[PDB]
Structure 1
Amino acid sequence: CPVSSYNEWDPLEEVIVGRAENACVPPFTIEVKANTYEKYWPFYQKQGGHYFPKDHLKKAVAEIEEMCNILKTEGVTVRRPDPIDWSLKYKTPDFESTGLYSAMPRDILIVVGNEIIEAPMAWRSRFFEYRAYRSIIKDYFHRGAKWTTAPKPTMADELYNQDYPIHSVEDRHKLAAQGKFVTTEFEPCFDAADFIRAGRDIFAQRSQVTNYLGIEWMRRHLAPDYRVHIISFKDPNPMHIDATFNIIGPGIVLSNPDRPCHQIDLFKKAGWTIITPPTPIIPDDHPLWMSSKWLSMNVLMLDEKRVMVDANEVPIQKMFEKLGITTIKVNIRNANSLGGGFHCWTCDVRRRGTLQSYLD
């Protein structure tokens, strides 16, 4: 079976790497505003519907092609989504929108065992993102893999809190602590990147794009073989868990010092090593349209002792080296601007290993 991955660290054999081509700035709607820093709100307001800066995209394209060359050198088979113009305006009976990109396979695809799952998504500009990946998925399906598409939401107004009182990220953090997010519990929705795998146990967070119904759908669909746990953090990342709590080995996890886990004691009791990475050194003047500087810890493990890490982030490279983990440095400074690091730009399709429990 070409598809087989139970965790984030077993020896990597095949991976899907996103594309930066034709990425479009999403219209500035309520859910986009709730998942981005205010510094960029006017950019979205103005550039909405247009391509991200083409000079910047060209650099990202170059960085990602090099990343793929390195992956191939490290013995990994690389598949890429189909090139698509994301500027096309589509219209469902519930809304109309232009697209985003197919830069982050981690946001839409998650592999659990021999099954590839397409997440529903929660942004109107990402409704048809799955189209870029169908050629690959059908190929794996023809080769024996299980293929699942979680229920696609209508993304009607009822799914969003149109009047979400966010005027700054600080407001968002407070609302979030109150259990208030831009997405309601109207219908299931989730981004696959809000889930992180550790064999029989999968961890998820309720975020601005992943609601409890979405998590419950995953929990119910995967039981009894897998257990989906809900964890939460202080001042959480609006969307996606991999730059907050990145599991890098059996019983080893990188925990973002700025977003501590409320359930950290569950992990300590299981005898897990919680590593807090050093701060990112990325320039504050560098544009990060989505996500934050913590992309430095959004690493991808080639195996337990080999990590693909940002070439510029020396301090975290040192941390890994002191732990006896070989650093494969790759520069994706411009690709970072699109909202992701190594874990985000990929979806591990096949890792060599079996299903096991690490929480004991």
Structure 2
Amino acid sequence: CPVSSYNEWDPLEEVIVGRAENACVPPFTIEVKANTYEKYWPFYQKQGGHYFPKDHLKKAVAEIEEMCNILKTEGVTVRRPDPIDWSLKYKTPDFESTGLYSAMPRDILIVVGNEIIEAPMAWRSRFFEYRAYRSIIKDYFHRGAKWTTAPKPTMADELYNQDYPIHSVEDRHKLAAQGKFVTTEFEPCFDAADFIRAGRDIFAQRSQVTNYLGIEWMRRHLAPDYRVHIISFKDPNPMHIDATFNIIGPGIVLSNPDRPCHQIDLFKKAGWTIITPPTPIIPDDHPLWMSSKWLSMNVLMLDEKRVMVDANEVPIQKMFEKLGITTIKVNIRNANSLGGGFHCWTCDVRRRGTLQSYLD
């Protein structure tokens, strides 16, 4: 089967890498507001529905092409989504919106074994994001892979707390700690990037885009072979888990020092090594429209001893090297702006290995 990946570190053979082409700023609706830094709120308000800065997008395209060249050199087969104009305005019976991009394969696709699963998403501007990936998925389907699409939400107003009392990121953190998110439990919704894989155990977090109904859907769909565990963090990332708790090997995880895990003892009891990466050196002046400076730890493992890491973030490169992990340095500084690092910009389709348990 062309599709076969049970975790985040076995020898990578095939990967899907996203595109920066035609990326559009999403309209400033409540769920966008709840997943971005106040600093950028006026940018969303003014540029909503327009392309991201074209001079910036062009630099990202260049950086990503080079990343693909390096992947091919490292023996990895690269697939890319179809080019699409994300500015088209679509309309369902529940809402109207323009699209976002197909830059982050990790946000929408997740491979569990021989199965590729398309996440439902939770943003209105990402309702039709799966269209960029269908040519690839149908190809794998024709070659034997299982293909699943989690239930697509209506994304009607009921799925959101229109009046989410967030005036700043500190408020979101307080609300988050209270168990209050911009998304309700009206219907299942989730981004695939809120799940991180370790063989028979998958970890997920309830976030601004991934509700308990969405996690239960995954849990119920994957059982009995896979166990889905819910974990939480202090000052959690609004959406996605791969720049907070990035699992990099059998029993080894990178834990973001600013977002400590409440269930860290479960990992310590299992004898896992928790590594806290050095702080990011990315300029505070550099625009990160989504995500944060912690993209530095959003690494991609080519195998247990080869990591693709940012060329600029020397301190984390040095951490991997003292651990005997070969660093493959690639610069994606402008690509980061879109909200992702190496783990976000890819979706590992095939890794050489078997299904195993590491939590014991």
Coarse TM-score class (shorter-chain normalised)? over 0.9
Offset at residue 20 of structure 1 (A)? 0.1
CA distance in 2, matches of 1:60, 1:114: 31
Q: List structure 1 runs of 4+ shifted beyond 6 angstroms.
A: none
Offset at residue 272 of structure 1 (A)? 0.1
CA distance in 1, matches of 2:213, 2:358: 26
Offset at residue 240 of structure 1 (A)? 0.1
- Stretches of structure 2 lacking an aligned partner (at least 5 in a row): none
CA distance in 2, matches of 1:157, 1:261: 32
CA distance in 2, matches of 1:284, 1:68: 27
CA distance in 1, matches of 2:143, 2:27: 38
CA distance in 2, matches of 1:34, 1:95: 19
CA distance in 2, matches of 1:171, 1:203: 26
CA distance in 1, matches of 2:206, 2:149: 20
Offset at residue 354 of structure 1 (A)? 0.1
Deviation string 1:135-194 (CA, Å, 9 cap, x unpaired) is 000000000000000000000000000000000000000000000000000000000000
CA distance in 1, matches of 2:52, 2:148: 31
**2:290 maps to 1:290:** yes
Offset at residue 237 of structure 1 (A)? 0.1
CA distance in 1, matches of 2:251, 2:142: 35
The 3-state SS of whatever aligns with 1:291 is coil
CA distance in 1, matches of 2:342, 2:96: 31
Equivalent position of 2:121 in the other structure:
121
CA distance in 1, matches of 2:280, 2:72: 27
Offset at residue 57 of structure 1 (A)? 0.1
Equivalent position of 1:65 in the other structure:
65
Deviation string 1:74-123 (CA, Å, 9 cap, x unpaired) is 00000000000000000000000000000000000000000000000000
Offset at residue 313 of structure 1 (A)? 0.1
Offset at residue 210 of structure 1 (A)? 0.1
CA distance in 2, matches of 1:172, 1:237: 10
CA distance in 1, matches of 2:277, 2:57: 29
- Stretches of structure 1 lacking an aligned partner (at least 5 in a row): none
Equivalent position of 1:326 in the other structure:
326
**2:96 maps to 1:91:** no
Offset at residue 267 of structure 1 (A)? 0.1
Q: Percent identity at matched positions?
A: 100
CA distance in 2, matches of 1:247, 1:98: 34
CA distance in 2, matches of 1:246, 1:194: 11
Offset at residue 70 of structure 1 (A)? 0.0
CA distance in 2, matches of 1:57, 1:172: 29
Offset at residue 208 of structure 1 (A)? 0.1
Offset at residue 263 of structure 1 (A)? 0.1
Offset at residue 227 of structure 1 (A)? 0.1
1:238-317 correspondence to structure 2 within 5 Å: 238-317=238-317
| Count of matched residue pairs | 360
CA distance in 2, matches of 1:18, 1:228: 26
Equivalent position of 1:12 in the other structure:
12
CA distance in 2, matches of 1:279, 1:218: 33
Offset at residue 289 of structure 1 (A)? 0.1
Offset at residue 34 of structure 1 (A)? 0.1
**2:204 maps to 1:218:** no
Offset at residue 317 of structure 1 (A)? 0.0
The 3-state SS of whatever aligns with 2:247 is strand
RMSD: 0.1
1:40-59 correspondence to structure 2 within 5 Å: 40-59=40-59
CA distance in 2, matches of 1:270, 1:36: 35
The 3-state SS of whatever aligns with 1:172 is helix
